[PDB]
Paper text:
The TatCel7A_CD protein was successfully crystallized, and two structures were solved, one apo structure without sugars bound (APO) and one thio-cellotrioside complex (SG3). Both structures were refined at 1.7 Å resolution in space group P21 with two protein chains, A and B, in the asymmetric unit. In the SG3 structure, from co-crystallization with thio-linked cellotriose, there are two cellotrioside molecules bound to each protein chain, in subsites − 6/− 5/− 4 and + 1/+ 2/+ 3, respectively. For the ligand in the − 6/− 5/− 4 position at the tunnel entrance, all glucose residues adopt the 4C1 chair conformation, but the C1 hydroxyl at the reducing end in subsite − 4 is predominantly in the α-position, with very weak density for a β-hydroxyl. Interestingly, the sugar ring at each site is flipped upside down compared to the orientation in the Michaelis complex of TreCel7A. The binding may represent a sliding intermediate during processive cellulose hydrolysis. The other thio-cellotrioside molecule in the SG3 structure, at + 1/+ 2/+ 3, is in register and aligns well with the glycan binding at the product sites of the TreCel7A Michaelis complex. The + 1 and + 2 glucosides are in 4C1 chair conformations, whereas the + 3 unit at the reducing end adopts a 1S3 skew conformation, again with α-hydroxyl predominance at the anomeric carbon. Overall, the TatCel7A_CD structures are very similar (0.18 Å root mean square deviation, RMSD), although there is a general ‘tightening’ of the protein around the active site in SG3 compared to APO, which is most pronounced at the A4-loop near the product sites.
In many of these fungi, the major secreted enzymes are glycoside hydrolase family 7 (GH7) cellobiohydrolases (CBH). CBHs within GH7 are readily distinguished because several loops are further elongated, effectively enclosing the active site in a tunnel. This enables the CBHs to act processively along a cellulose chain and cleave off numerous cellobiose units before detachment from the substrate, which is believed to be key to their efficiency on highly crystalline cellulose. The GH7 CBHs of T. harzianum (ThaCel7A) and T. atroviride (TatCel7A) share the GH7_CD-linker-CBM1 bimodular organization and are very similar to each other and to TreCel7A, with ~ 80% pairwise sequence identities.
Author numbering: 1 to 430
């Protein structure tokens, strides 16, 4: 896509800490940028909208390449339109923001400069952050995660992307998302189908695949930590059902693992570890520090709340695994007990570790779930299963919860606050 400037693009500042062996940390002057899908797109250098509602303009966008030549991305009013504000090392993402239109959530990337995403190499290192999930009810997901995106949003590989990282281009994840309007310097117009249940979104003929490490997908009720390997580490474009994922007739027909080797303490039999109030080890009405440590043998997790360190609880009642670590043993035992082969089919932890040994971009987001109402995270899922089915119970939310239209009307002032990001070698951030 091109760049237009009727709305200025200024990346909100966000400080974070880089820590080194010894425990010394220094402040880093980062910024955040909104993902390109959220932007107004119109004719370059001016003219009609190229996309409006959930349909493309056929005149401006008769095919994928022409559309990218004729259409530009605009700047974003971060607070007024998208409900994104920063203060020092704190980032707030509001749920429903009404200005011209109703906007629901946002996806942001941490920047090293105004034209480059920050790239984190996770293996042998740890990532720590503080979060307030107190205003995240059933059906919402405040997510912090890593994806194997290009630092420049694809600009050097795809010269028809003139917007680059400055405008939040180049997203990919292990779902191989097809809802993206621009992928690899081309629009996603050919075969585009508008969503049945969402006036603002649709599903294109292409998706955008890459490795994904979901550090944190959570609300006040449940949380999950999930590696997703892909057969190619970095970004590749997929077509239709061969993207796999939720919007494809064969979930497992692609090159990425859309399921992941997920660790949700509730799903693994600990019903008192994480929840609202003093009945829970980690009280979701109060700030939580979440620390995640990556090594070749596995991923480890601890939490700090009110100065108290709590290690990840042991898996409880999971046949053949009594640890608290995402390692090859756990991932295999999970597949055996709960079903499925996707994670190991796509190379498992060995293949994930290849992405963890290269740069990944930090994503901070808030969303609700049109496909499955976040029931996979915080309720009983699938709907045909019940709490006696192995792996079915993931949280205490009602199976009727999380319908986007309902949560948007009932809980519009929901929000997530991420803060005090720290990164460095294992043992260095605490
Ligand atoms: C849940 O985790 C807590 C905190 O680690 C632990 O004390 C408790 O024993 C765990 N519950 C079960 C059923 O294992
Ligand atoms: O799609 C057009 C629409 O996009 C949104 S994102 C803009 O904020 C608005 O001004 C414009 O009319
Ligand atoms: O409303 C803000 C923004 O939302 C997204 S959903 C629209 O596609 C864009 O035109 C505008
Ligand atoms: O797509 C929804 C949800 O599906 C589950 S299977 C994945 O583990 C998670 O990362 C993703 O956000
Ligand atoms: O939660 C793990 C995984 O469960 C399966 S059953 C869901 O369909 C998917 O979105 C995710
Ligand atoms: O893809 C862009 C769209 O993303 C989300 O669905 C937002 O709720 C909407 O406002 C826009
Ligand atoms: O397709 C994904 C679903 O299938 C798996 O085998 C699991 O049992 C279920 O929790 C999910
Ligand atoms: Ni194609
Ligand atoms: Ni119980």
């Amino acid at each position: 896509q091109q760049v237009c400037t009727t709305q200025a693009e200024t990346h909100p500042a966000l400080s974070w800490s880089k820590c080194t062996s010894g425990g010394s940390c220094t402040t880093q002057a980062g910024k955040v940028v909104l993902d390109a899908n959220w932007r107004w797109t119109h004719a370059y250098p001016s003219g009609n909208n190229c996309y409006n509602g959930n349909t493309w303009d056929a005149t401006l966008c008769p095919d994928d390449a022409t559309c990218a030549k004729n259409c530009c991305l605009e700047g974003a009013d971060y607070s007024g339109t998208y409900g994104v504000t920063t203060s020092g090392n704190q980032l707030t993402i509001d749920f429903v923001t009404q200005s011209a239109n109703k906007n629901v959530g946002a996806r942001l990337y941490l920047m090293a400069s105004d034209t480059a995403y920050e790239e984190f190499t996770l293996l042998n290192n740890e990532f720590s952050f503080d979060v307030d999930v107190s205003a995240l009810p059933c059906g919402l997901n405040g997510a912090l995660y890593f994806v194997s995106m290009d630092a420049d949003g694809g600009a050097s590989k795809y010269p028809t992307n003139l917007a680059g990282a400055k405008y939040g281009t180049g997203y990919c994840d292990s779902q191989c998302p097809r809802d993206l309007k621009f992928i690899s310097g081309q629009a996603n117009v050919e075969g585009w189908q508008p969503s049945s249940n969402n006036a603002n979104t649709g599903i294109g003929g292409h998706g955008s695949c890459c490795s994904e490490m979901d550090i944190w997908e959570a609300n006040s009720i449940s949380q999950a930590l999930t590696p997703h390997p892909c057969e190619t580490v970095g970004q590749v474009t997929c077509s239709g059902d061969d993207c796999g994922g939720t919007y494809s007739n064969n979930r497992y027909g692609g090159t990425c693992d859309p399921d992941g080797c997920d660790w949700n303490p509730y799903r693994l039999g600990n019903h008192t570890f994480y929840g609202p109030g003093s009945g829970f080890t980690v009280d979701t009405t109060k700030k939580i520090t979440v620390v995640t440590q990556f090594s070749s043998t596995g991923i480890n997790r601890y939490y700090v709340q009110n100065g108290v360190k709590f290690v990840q609880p042991n898996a409880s009642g999971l046949s053949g695994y009594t640890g608290n670590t995402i390692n090859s043993a756990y991932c295999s035992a999970e597949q055996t007990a709960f079903g499925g082969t996707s994670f190991t089919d796509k190379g498992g932890l060995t293949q994930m570790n290849k992405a963890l040994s290269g740069g990944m971009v930090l994503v901070l987001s808030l969303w609700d779930d049109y496909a499955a109402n976040m029931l996979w995270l915080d309720s009983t899922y699938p709907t045909n299963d019940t709490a006696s089915t192995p792996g079915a119970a993931r949280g205490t939310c009602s199976t009727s919860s999380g319908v986007p239209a309902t949560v948007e009307q009932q809980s519009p002032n929901s929000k997530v606050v991420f803060s005090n990001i720290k990164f460095g070698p294992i043992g260095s951030t605490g």
